Enzyme design. Structure first.
Site, mmCIF file in Angstrom:
data_model
loop_
_atom_site.group_PDB
_atom_site.id
_atom_site.type_symbol
_atom_site.label_atom_id
_atom_site.label_comp_id
_atom_site.label_asym_id
_atom_site.label_seq_id
_atom_site.Cartn_x
_atom_site.Cartn_y
_atom_site.Cartn_z
ATOM 1 N N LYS A 102 0.816 -1.217 0.000
ATOM 2 C CA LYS A 102 0.000 0.000 0.000
ATOM 3 C C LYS A 102 0.847 1.262 0.000
ATOM 4 O O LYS A 102 1.830 1.356 0.732
ATOM 5 C CB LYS A 102 -0.907 0.062 1.237
ATOM 6 C CG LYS A 102 -2.213 0.804 1.006
ATOM 7 C CD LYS A 102 -3.021 0.157 -0.106
ATOM 8 C CE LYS A 102 -4.405 0.773 -0.213
ATOM 9 N NZ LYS A 102 -5.201 0.146 -1.303
ATOM 10 N N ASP A 142 -5.930 3.989 -6.886
ATOM 11 C CA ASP A 142 -6.722 3.969 -5.664
ATOM 12 C C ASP A 142 -7.443 5.304 -5.521
ATOM 13 O O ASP A 142 -7.626 6.016 -6.512
ATOM 14 C CB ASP A 142 -5.841 3.660 -4.454
ATOM 15 C CG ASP A 142 -6.580 2.902 -3.369
ATOM 16 O OD1 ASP A 142 -7.755 2.542 -3.578
ATOM 17 O OD2 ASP A 142 -5.978 2.648 -2.308
ATOM 18 N N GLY A 216 -25.584 2.993 -3.543
ATOM 19 C CA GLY A 216 -24.406 3.586 -4.171
ATOM 20 C C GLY A 216 -24.481 3.292 -5.656
ATOM 21 O O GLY A 216 -24.542 2.143 -6.090
ATOM 22 N N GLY A 218 -22.177 4.533 -8.093
ATOM 23 C CA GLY A 218 -20.960 4.910 -8.776
ATOM 24 C C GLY A 218 -20.593 3.871 -9.812
ATOM 25 O O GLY A 218 -21.474 3.204 -10.360
ATOM 26 N N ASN A 219 -19.299 3.725 -10.096
ATOM 27 C CA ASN A 219 -18.863 2.695 -11.033
ATOM 28 C C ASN A 219 -19.292 1.313 -10.561
ATOM 29 O O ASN A 219 -19.947 0.562 -11.298
ATOM 30 C CB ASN A 219 -17.344 2.761 -11.202
ATOM 31 C CG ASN A 219 -16.820 1.741 -12.187
ATOM 32 O OD1 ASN A 219 -17.137 1.787 -13.375
ATOM 33 N ND2 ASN A 219 -16.010 0.810 -11.698
ATOM 34 N N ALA A 220 -18.959 0.977 -9.313
ATOM 35 C CA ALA A 220 -19.227 -0.361 -8.796
ATOM 36 C C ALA A 220 -20.720 -0.653 -8.760
ATOM 37 O O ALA A 220 -21.166 -1.692 -9.251
ATOM 38 C CB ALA A 220 -18.615 -0.515 -7.405
ATOM 39 N N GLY A 221 -21.510 0.257 -8.189
ATOM 40 C CA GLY A 221 -22.937 0.003 -8.062
ATOM 41 C C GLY A 221 -23.646 -0.084 -9.401
ATOM 42 O O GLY A 221 -24.438 -1.004 -9.641
ATOM 43 N N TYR A 222 -23.371 0.871 -10.294
ATOM 44 C CA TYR A 222 -24.031 0.876 -11.595
ATOM 45 C C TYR A 222 -23.665 -0.365 -12.395
ATOM 46 O O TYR A 222 -24.538 -1.021 -12.980
ATOM 47 C CB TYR A 222 -23.665 2.137 -12.375
ATOM 48 C CG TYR A 222 -23.711 1.948 -13.876
ATOM 49 C CD1 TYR A 222 -24.918 1.766 -14.537
ATOM 50 C CD2 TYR A 222 -22.545 1.944 -14.630
ATOM 51 C CE1 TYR A 222 -24.964 1.589 -15.906
ATOM 52 C CE2 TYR A 222 -22.582 1.767 -15.998
ATOM 53 C CZ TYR A 222 -23.793 1.590 -16.630
ATOM 54 O OH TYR A 222 -23.834 1.415 -17.993
#
Ligand SMILES: NC(=O)c1ccc[n+]([C@@H]2O[C@H](COP(=O)([O-])OP(=O)(O)OC[C@H]3O[C@@H](n4cnc5c(N)ncnc54)[C@H](OP(=O)(O)O)[C@@H]3O)[C@@H](O)[C@H]2O)c1
Ligand SMILES: N[C@@H](CCC(=O)O)C(=O)O
Length: 416
Positions: A102, A142, A216, A218-222
Site C-alpha cells: 500500500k 486507488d 451507491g 458509482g462505477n461499482a454500483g451501476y
C-alpha cells in the site's frame, strides 16, 4: 480509533478460529517493510513544496506485494499500514501469487494542476524506486488516483529503469495504449456478480427473475446492477446514490437511470419510480442486497430489518460485526467485503501477467479467468464456512491467513 490497531485486532480474532503459532502471529502483526519518503515537486508559481509519501509492504511470502496509491489530505501511516495488511488477505483469499502492499501521499489533489499532478507522480516514483518493481512491488490506482497517473508513474519508472525489463508490469491500472488490460472498468462488478451467482447456487436460489437492490450508484454500483440484470436475468427494483434513491417493483433499467443521473445530477425523481431514502432501501424484501457505497451502512440499528437472502458486500466493510452476527442469526448469507470485491485485484493480477508475458488477452479470456478465480475462491470460503461452523468473514480470514502462514512456513521464515 486507529486503523492499524483495528486491523491487528481483526487478525487476532481470525487467529482465534485457526491453529497458528505465536511467532507467525507476531510476524503477521508487523509490516515487513515501511518506507516513508519526502516527495518534492516545483509548483506552477515556481516554489518547491515537499509532500509525505508512504509505501508499506506488509508481507511478501507468497510473492511480490500489491496495492494501490491514495492521494488523500487525511492520509496517515496507520491507514496505509492497515490497508496493506488488508490487501495481504485480499490477495490470499483469491489465491494470487502476491503479497500485501500500500502506498499514499498526504496531498489534496483537488488543488493541484495537471502538470503538478504529473510532477507529483514522477517524484513519488523517483522517491520509492528502490522498493518497487515488476517482481518486488506493483502499485495500482486507488482513491483520487486514476489510469492517467498510473501511466505517468510507469513512464517515470521506465525512464529510471533504462528499459532493462518489463517496465509495463511495474504498475497496474494503466491506459490500454500502454500495457493496459481489458475488463478493468467492470472488474469489481463482474467479480461481485460471479460471487452472487455462486452464493445463489449454494443456497439453491434461481436468480432468473429475482430482485436486487443496490446502494451507491458509482462505477461499482451501476456496473453491478447492469451486469446483474443482463447476466443473471434479475429484476433491479431499487438503486440509490449519494443523494436519494428510487423504487419500482416491476424493474428498473440501469442504463436509463445512469442517463438520468448524468442529466439531472442524481437518481432522484426518476420517472415511474418512487423516491426513497437509503435506510428503507436497505430493508426491501429483495433476493440479494449489494451495498456498494459508504462503509458501515448495516449496523445493530437496522441489522434485524434486513430482508435480503444474500448480502454482497461490494463496498469496503459496509457491515459491522454486530450486524454480522445478527444477520448470521437470521440465516442471511453474507459475502465478505474483501472476497466480494476481489475482482479488481484479480484483474490487476491478470494485467500484470499480460505485461510480464508481453502477450495480451481479449475480453472473453479475462472474463472466463475471472469467473474461474472468483468461483474457486467463493467455494473455498464457503466450504470453510460449513466445515468450521464459523462466520463467512471468519472463514475468509481463516483461508487467507492459512495460505500466508503456509507460504511463510515453506520459506522457513517461521519454524513452527
Ligand atoms: O467513481 P464514483 O465516485 O462515482 O463511485 P464511488 O466513489 O464508489 O461512490 C459510490 C456511489 O455511492 C455514492 N455514495 C457516497 N456516499 C453514499 C452513501 N452514504 N450512501 C449511498 N451512496 C453513497 C457516491 O456518490 P458520490 O461519489 O458523488 O459522493 C457514488 O455515487
Ligand atoms: N483494492 C484497491 C487497490 C487494489 C488494486 O486494485 O490493486 C482498489 O480499490 O483499487
Amino acid at each position: 480509533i486507529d486503523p492499524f490497531e483495528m486491523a491487528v485486532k481483526q487478525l487476532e480474532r481470525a487467529a482465534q478460529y485457526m491453529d497458528i503459532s505465536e511467532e507467525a502471529l507476531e510476524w503477521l502483526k508487523k509490516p515487513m517493510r515501511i518506507v516513508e519518503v519526502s516527495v518534492p515537486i516545483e509548483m506552477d508559481d515556481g516554489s518547491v513544496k515537499v509532500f509525505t509519501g508512504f509505501r508499506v509492504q506488509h508481507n511478501w511470502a507468497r510473492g511480490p506485494t500489491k496495492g494501490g496509491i491514495r492521494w488523500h489530505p487525511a492520509e496517515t501511516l496507520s491507514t496505509v499500514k492497515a490497508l496493506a495488511t488488508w490487501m495481504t488477505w485480499k490477495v490470499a483469499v483469491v489465491d494470487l501469487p502476491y503479497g500485501g502492499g500500500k502506498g499514499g501521499i498526504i496531498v489534496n489533489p483537488k488543488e493541484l494542476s495537471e502538470r503538478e499532478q504529473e510532477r507529483l507522480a514522477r517524484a513519488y516514483i523517483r522517491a520509492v524506486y528502490d522498493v518497487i518493481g515488476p517482481w518486488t512491488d506493483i502499485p495500482a490506482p486507488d482513491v483520487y488516483t486514476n489510469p492517467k497517473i498510473m501511466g505517468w508513474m510507469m513512464d517515470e519508472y521506465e525512464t529510471i529503469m533504462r528499459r532493462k525489463g518489463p517496465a509495463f508490469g511495474v504498475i497496474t491500472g494503466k491506459p490500454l495504449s500502454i500495457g493496459g488490460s481489458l475488463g478493468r472498468g467492470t472488474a469489481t462488478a463482474q467479480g461481485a456478480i460471479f460471487t452472487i451467482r455462486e452464493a445463489a447456487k449454494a443456497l439453491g436460489i434461481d436468480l432468473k427473475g429475482k430482485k436486487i437492490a443496490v446502494q451507491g450508484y458509482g462505477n461499482a454500483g451501476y456496473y453491478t446492477a447492469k451486469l446483474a440484470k443482463e447476466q443473471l436475468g434479475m429484476t433491479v427494483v431499487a438503486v440509490s446514490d449519494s443523494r436519494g434513491g428510487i423504487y419500482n417493483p416491476d424493474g428498473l433499467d440501469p442504463d436509463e437511470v445512469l442517463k438520468w443521473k448524468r442529466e439531472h445530477g442524481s437518481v432522484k425523481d426518476f420517472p415511474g419510480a418512487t423516491n426513497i431514502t437509503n435506510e428503507e432501501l436497505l430493508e426491501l424484501e429483495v433476493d440479494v442486497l449489494a451495498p456498494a457505497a459508504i462503509e458501515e451502512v448495516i449496523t445493530e440499528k437496522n441489522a434485524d430489518n434486513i430482508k435480503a437472502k444474500i448480502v454482497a458486500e461490494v463496498a469496503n466493510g459496509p457491515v459491522t460485526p454486530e450486524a454480522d452476527d445478527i444477520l448470521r442469526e437470521k440465516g442471511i448469507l453474507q459475502i465478505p467485503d474483501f472476497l466480494c470485491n476481489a475482482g479488481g485485484v484479480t484483474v490487476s493480477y491478470f494485467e500484470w501477467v499480460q505485461n510480464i508475458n508481453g502477450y495480451y488477452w481479449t475480453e472473453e479470456e479475462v472474463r472466463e479467468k475471472l469467473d474461474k478465480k472468483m468461483t474457486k475462491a467463493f467455494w473455498e470460503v464457503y466450504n470453510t464456512h460449513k466445515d468450521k461452523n464459523i462466520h463467512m468473514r471468519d472463514a475468509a480470514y481463516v483461508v487467507a491467513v492459512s495460505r500466508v502462514y503456509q507460504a511463510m512456513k515453506d520459506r522457513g521464515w517461521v519454524k513452527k
